[PDB]
Design a protein around this ligand. Structure first.
Ligand SMILES: [Cl-]
Ligand SMILES: [Zn+2]
Lengths: 117, 76
């Protein structure tokens, strides 16, 4: 029923188009769309820690850990086929997860299709 | 002996310590005066990051030396 637009053939696109911002997510407790961490236990997506001087995120991911005890979280936008930034609230350090692929797959995430943001 | 620490804002705080105090002890002293938890602190002396488990004398930190406090960054 739909017809080809009379503009399709000669549509004038801008010469210097600011490549649209890569896709993303949003903390489920605030408006942050950057510095987001997905907890590997429940798949919650929350923002990074707030630092003493006010920099950082809004502390939602760490508060989630305090409440649940779920230790691992991966930083969205850092996932590539070779790995990703994973933090352990438990061990207080960035760690490696040999089973990251399975862990991410658990929530319907193809660790191979993800692109570093 | 007294040593000075430049805070995140550039302010100067003074601490009473001994050459044998550990970096952990020092960070505890900083929490007492500035309110920043030790695990959120990162201390630098003459460009060198001070490590827990080491003492002030290990870094040749003496009377009236000045340390620099910066944020210890971490994920999560
Ligand atoms: Cl969004
Ligand atoms: Zn948030």
């Amino acid at each position: 029923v739909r017809q080809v637009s009379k503009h399709a053939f000669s549509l004038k696109q801008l010469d210097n188009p600011a490549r649209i911002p890569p896709c993303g997510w949003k903390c489920s407790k605030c408006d942050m769309r950057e510095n987001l961490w997905l907890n590997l236990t429940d798949g919650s997506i929350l923002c990074g820690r707030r630092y003493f001087d006010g920099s950082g995120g809004n502390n939602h991911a760490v508060e989630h850990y305090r409440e649940t005890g779920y230790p691992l979280a991966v930083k969205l936008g850092t996932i590539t086929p070779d790995g990703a930034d994973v933090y352990s609230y438990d061990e207080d350090d960035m760690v490696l997860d040999p089973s990251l692929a399975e862990h991410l797959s658990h929530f319907g995430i193809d660790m191979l299709k993800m692109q570093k943001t | 002996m007294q040593i000075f620490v430049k805070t995140l804002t550039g302010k100067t705080i003074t601490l009473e310590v001994e050459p044998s105090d550990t970096i952990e002890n020092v960070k505890a002293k900083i929490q007492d005066k500035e309110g920043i938890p030790p695990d959120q602190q990162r201390l630098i002396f003459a460009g060198k990051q001070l490590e827990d488990g080491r003492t002030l004398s290990d870094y040749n930190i003496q009377k009236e030396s000045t340390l620099h406090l910066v944020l210890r960054l971490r994920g999560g």
